[PDB]
Symmetry: D2
Subunit: 44 residues, 4 copies
């Protein structure tokens, strides 16, 4: 009973961590785009 | 100017798609845990 | 025991649904930016 | 052109911040469930 709930909890937490990693990468790409757009605005 | 903005937009959207895929996997693991907990409650 | 695990499962699932809603909104803002950038590229 | 691209970028980043906040809440609920399951296993 509890053994299997814990196995499934660990699978949830594994997937959570993959989501957190991909989210930081997305944040970085979005922030890079923002810096570039801002640069092009400033330089004209 | 615009060429590079589009390149960076495509990289954002690539990362977004990977986020959507990992989110469906997370949803599935959470839904599976919920179904199991509910099963054990009913039993 | 199991009663409390189910209460906490429902809180996880509540937060999951809020994450899914915010994610669709983020996708829409990103897709709108893409359409605008593409428009400005095409029109020159 | 660029003014509107920046306006839309700010709206993307606003939504991103709301996603980060909801993600920490989700992480907390998941971590709380894990700690409880572990506690009940140990007991």
């Amino acid at each position: 009973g509890i053994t299997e709930a814990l196995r499934l909890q660990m699978e949830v937490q594994k997937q959570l961590h993959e989501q957190l990693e991909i989210q930081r990468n997305l944040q970085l790409r979005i922030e890079e785009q923002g810096k570039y757009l801002q640069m092009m605005f400033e330089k004209q």
